[PDB]
Amino acid sequence: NMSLENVAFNVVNKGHFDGQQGEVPVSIINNTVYTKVDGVDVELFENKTTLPVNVAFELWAKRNIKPVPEVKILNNLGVDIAANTVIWDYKRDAPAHISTIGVCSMTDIAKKPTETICAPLTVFFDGRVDGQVDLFRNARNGVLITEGSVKGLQPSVGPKQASLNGVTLIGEAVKTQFNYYKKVDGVVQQLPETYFTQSRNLQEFKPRSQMEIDFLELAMDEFIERYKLEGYAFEHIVYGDFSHSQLGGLALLIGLAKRFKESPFELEDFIPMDSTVKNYFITDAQTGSSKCVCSVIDLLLDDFVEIIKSQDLSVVSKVVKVTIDYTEISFMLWCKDGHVETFYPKLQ
């Protein structure tokens, strides 16, 4: 049944593996898969993974092409493997998980999730597929997503957005907001209250609240007065300090978005991966201000304002724990004379 030439047949005719019969000639060289079309070789897939070229080619061809959770969400929930599907990490151009379950013979540790080898693993189940909700009930450790209610299980509302072929979006003609469920050692877990990152980027940044709309349109002094943000160091934390050689603050993506429309700068994504907290080496082209490690998070500005207004400001410095994307992000809060000095995310 399964064969390399058959996988390439599906790619050239269906753009991915669709379970069609047929074979096309394949040549493998330079960590790349080629197929001969009318006597000339045409590249189909360049292996950017640590797996053998033919294996990653098969896993990429069999990737999930439906709206799926972003890898950072699955990582924060501790998912180790997916049930009968492949979650493709488009940030790394590699499969999001090492092993597979009933997908590819070279990476399979099992054919079905109920096998013994899958017991200590947090298997990801998709309720939109038949029988996977029931498989979640019988799994020792697992994470389940659904579009609607699950009888006898308390749900946790996930993010509004999901990944569709590497494009993060809030679905309009399709459903991207799921119900999340988790089991540990046979015991269903109650997921905590959590904020969610917006998963936006600088070039295509769009405001998602009237507070964010006012932040981008209005000036710094005018915005801080309107939302009564005196004493919270928004000039440093959000807008960023560019007067010195060392860049100060600038930890919210919306603050970088406002700056980029005025003046450009360089963001070095030295760990190209999906994470709730991103680390960038930033170099400002206009002034020369730079910082080796700029921890950046894309929170809705209303959510960040709700957090910063919810802290005690009578201590020089302390640790603030905030559950974001189902993981605890430890912040360092600095205060002086009852007002916020600085407030930034840490490495890990």
Added chain:
Amino acid sequence: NMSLENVAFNVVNKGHFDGQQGEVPVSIINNTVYTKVDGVDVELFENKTTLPVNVAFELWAKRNIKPVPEVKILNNLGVDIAANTVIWDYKRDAPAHISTIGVCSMTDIAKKPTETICAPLTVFFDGRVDGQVDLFRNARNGVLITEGSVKGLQPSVGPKQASLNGVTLIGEAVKTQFNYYKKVDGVVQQLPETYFTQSRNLQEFKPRSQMEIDFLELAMDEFIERYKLEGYAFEHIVYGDFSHSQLGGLALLIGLAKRFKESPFELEDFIPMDSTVKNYFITDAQTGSSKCVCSVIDLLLDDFVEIIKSQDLSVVSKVVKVTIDYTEISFMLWCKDGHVETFYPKLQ
């Protein structure tokens, strides 16, 4: 005469092989050609082909840098090899043809096209080069292009555009529209009536007719009324249906061009090559609508309108054959109650 160090000499001084004498030091590593400039290695060429690095480097250096036919045209005409030149496929970043004739010692099957080994092959001749028109007369199988008339041979007008260093353009200070001629087994062939693709792209799409101008500026309902297109399913075929999870229709490049200026979308060119019919995996970022295989063709809208108005609409479904770029493209025409349901290009 021929040497690797001499080829690199021409590249660093002439940008390509110009037949100049001289040698520069060359080091080959990581499927890439380097040259030492003032004690440091500088990359000259990264081999993206299935040929050895030094051979593809020589063929790329000796590529034709004059306006030449697009590879899709040469493929549709069945060209297997070029006479004393190299047609470089910039879509694949590889030579458009396997073997050569009197160009590179490693790929040469012959020095001149009149040799015996070139008889069963469709050799491409360029009338702008001296003696190549006469060589075409004496060749068994061949394809000839000229700027003017050829005495005693009936011509076929080719496309307006040609490729100049990988840039498709309609020449203004240079001639890009050629006369085409073909011989099979010593017999001159009469090339059929054919449409020609426009070879445009989304980002730089420009209208080339008043009908195309009206299509991009006016709305869907207003455009269909002006050109009396009721009953031909232009809303589905050309404008595209985005209300469902499966994208419907959207097979003309001009329809994608109008959509992209409003909302962005992803086009996955999973077979990166020059072809009359292109296949894309499309993912709409705004709605979430997607389709694994979206057959796309860039016809002048007047040409597509002429075709769709030239069919019989009394059958549920049938095959429509249209000669485009000198090749037969088979379409699937669906009709209901005397009007067009859908109409799309097939795989191959």
Added chain:
Amino acid sequence: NMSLENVAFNVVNKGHFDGQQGEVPVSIINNTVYTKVDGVDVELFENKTTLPVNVAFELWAKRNIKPVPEVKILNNLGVDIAANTVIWDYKRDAPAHISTIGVCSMTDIAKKPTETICAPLTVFFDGRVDGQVDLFRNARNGVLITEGSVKGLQPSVGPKQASLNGVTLIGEAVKTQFNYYKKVDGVVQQLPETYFTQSRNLQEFKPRSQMEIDFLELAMDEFIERYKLEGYAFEHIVYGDFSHSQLGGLALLIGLAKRFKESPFELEDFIPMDSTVKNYFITDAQTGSSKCVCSVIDLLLDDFVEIIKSQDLSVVSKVVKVTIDYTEISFMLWCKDGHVETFYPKLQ
């Protein structure tokens, strides 16, 4: 002390080597450095150099992240090696110099610049680092940069701009204009009068003088009259001739910048490196005019006007020598009937 796993620790936590203790797991494959993050491999660095992957990874991690001279300046001054730092060539994505001094064990020829092996080499010293000015006094061959005066040494003012993490800029919150000093065989050299290139690019070209502002806004005939440039062939040399198949002139970057905003064109940087004179294979998309070797230089228009008005125009053709970026650039000046025919930079 030094180790591959420790270097990767600094990269994932500090974006570069910062001298921190710690180790992260590293796997090397496909000429690329990977690290395991939560069970999956994440790429840290793809070796684009001719050095072993681990060595170039260490040198890139230890690159200088302060405003440093552009490589073309250091090359024109004959620098062979840097003292206790790594100048990273972002044009080639490789270290700007072969060997190192007290940086990396695999590339070190010495630990300190005063060793015997460093005597015949032009060592680069940075006065902003303690003791490097005094080390320059005791070096046989060397180049020194400072922000202020050096007691007992006559300075040479360098360019306004410097490179900060591969971004060329004129510093505003940091100092990018240095004083330059050079010694040959123990004898301090007097650097000649020189122009400086502006190191701009087409997409982000910005005028830096009222003459340049008038050049971009005004028309060709209107600009030549305002600055009294009749008889100097600015239509050909600066604006470029596109009426023929062979592109004529067009050797100043500002002339290409004005053209690109009107019509696009292709620039093939077939020697990707930092140099005072750049060579491009240009293909005009609008007209089809092209030229294999287009020598391009980015001089301030006032500087180029000062040069062209400073020549004798009574000879058919002769060589004009101009010291630019501390190197002699030989120009070919063609004149007819007392006016300039053409004037262009040569290869090397």
Added chain:
Amino acid sequence: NMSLENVAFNVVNKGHFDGQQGEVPVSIINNTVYTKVDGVDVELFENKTTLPVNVAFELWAKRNIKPVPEVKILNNLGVDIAANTVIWDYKRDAPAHISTIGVCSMTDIAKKPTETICAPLTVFFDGRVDGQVDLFRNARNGVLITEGSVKGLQPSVGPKQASLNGVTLIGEAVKTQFNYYKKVDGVVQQLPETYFTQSRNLQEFKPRSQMEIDFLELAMDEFIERYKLEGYAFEHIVYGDFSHSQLGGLALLIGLAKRFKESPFELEDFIPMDSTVKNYFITDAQTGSSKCVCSVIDLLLDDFVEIIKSQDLSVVSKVVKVTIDYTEISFMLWCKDGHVETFYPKLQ
């Protein structure tokens, strides 16, 4: 602590990892580890594995250099991973097991065998190391070897021979015969009665019994008469039939050993690995007789005689199951008129 440069220090000074402090400079290229010795690079390790070069270098450096069970024995017992050691497969020049336990950060699934991830795996414990017997008692699945008695556990006597640095030997100044113990899902298993292969090769074949001594010294007809082997087809099964184009029988290594001293032949070990039954493509140089699949096993001739004399010969053909090296080897027994026609091992 752990580093690539530290591992290479141990290799150049101790031949393997000995836990010594120090670092030597290392360059990685061509899937090979090099170190600079007096200014020149010297190869330390060529990666013959499917793991990254640096990882296999660390695992090979930390391989077990004491007498350890042969890989075929561990595979037949279902061992998946070793506890705090590396069993190196010298037949494949690769580690015998995928993952490790407390050995290498890149391959470790756990630090100690008692962790949860090691529960479903058959972990190999070495009783000669402190605490590994007690760890076996508390492990869910495991295989244990000891030199002496284990209190409260019934032993299974293993082979006389063990592997020391890829050299199979019966220890004289060291102990190579161990007691074997196995647990499955917390339940200790009783290992069955089993024969053991001799693990010899053709070039260095030595007889290990007077029957084997008589087999090599005496002739075919003389040997069969002495041990009363009439009717068991030893001429075909053991001595081999070379009169026809297809080689017949010849399934015992001792039969090939006798033949090789007389006439040479080619053995293509097309699956180079340690297994109880080996498959060779044999081509006889003297006669031209060949056979694509010759299943070969190296049993003590007395053991094979004991087996063949313990079967019923009243059936045309049937399957005979024999437990060898703790695994069931299925044989095909063919008989005619109450005597053995042929008898050979199967594929798997």
Added chain:
Amino acid sequence: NMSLENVAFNVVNKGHFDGQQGEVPVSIINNTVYTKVDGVDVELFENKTTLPVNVAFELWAKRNIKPVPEVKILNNLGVDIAANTVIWDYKRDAPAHISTIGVCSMTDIAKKPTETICAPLTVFFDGRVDGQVDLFRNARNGVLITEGSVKGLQPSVGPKQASLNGVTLIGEAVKTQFNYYKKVDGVVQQLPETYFTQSRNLQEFKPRSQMEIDFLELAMDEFIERYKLEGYAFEHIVYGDFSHSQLGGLALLIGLAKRFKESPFELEDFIPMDSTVKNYFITDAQTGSSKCVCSVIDLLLDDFVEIIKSQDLSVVSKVVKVTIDYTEISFMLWCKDGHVETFYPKLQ
């Protein structure tokens, strides 16, 4: 039908492709084919060819495993391609011919030899396979081998020996001497009278005539007298001159064979390929005599004696043409005073 995983199934079960159904998991890396056996990867084939790894793996698996002509014979006859089989060159560990006919989809230029593309090529036909003799009759250019008579065709007797799995042998239980036939442009050719090389090697050299037996057993002076070889410079041509720094003569393999049993020497086969005349760089370990280019041929000593006695010795130097292995070998004959000075094969 055809697939990489199916080919690997045949290799692990049949040692080569036998047309069996089944698939085994395959991983491709390091220009090598691996398969997973009991959880570990086992190497199946290391690509030593210039073809992609998977293609050479398929061609090697489908190689001809019957007695086939040696590659040097097929090359001298101008064979370009084989009909529905693969002649494997074991000297180069690569396929003997570039393209194939009805064998591998990636290398096939045609499915059957009667197609048009196979007309200008010298296709090799094997009369032992049904219909291949009749296909030879209808082929334009071809070479045919048979074991018996071919009706209506005059035969040419080939060598006594043939290659069986890279082992050259004179068949005893199988037929290795064939009848040779050749057609050029539809015209059957009469193959000339030719000698044949013995295709022996030094280590396993065996005399094949009483003259060769006397040559190895007797001394130099005694052998020349017995066969009346005075005046033919056999001391220099055959025995070799080792008294000087430049080795003199020594062009017959039998002369090197006699020397190697006495004293060892180094033979550098710097073009490792099958050819009638071999070129070796020889370094004598006993004396220090060496020669960069020693052209060596392995003729039966009786054949060389017949040749050298059939020449005119009245010219200082001239060219002697001898047809060996169906190709003209040009010799240089030097004579002085009516006796042979020297006589050696040339380069090509």
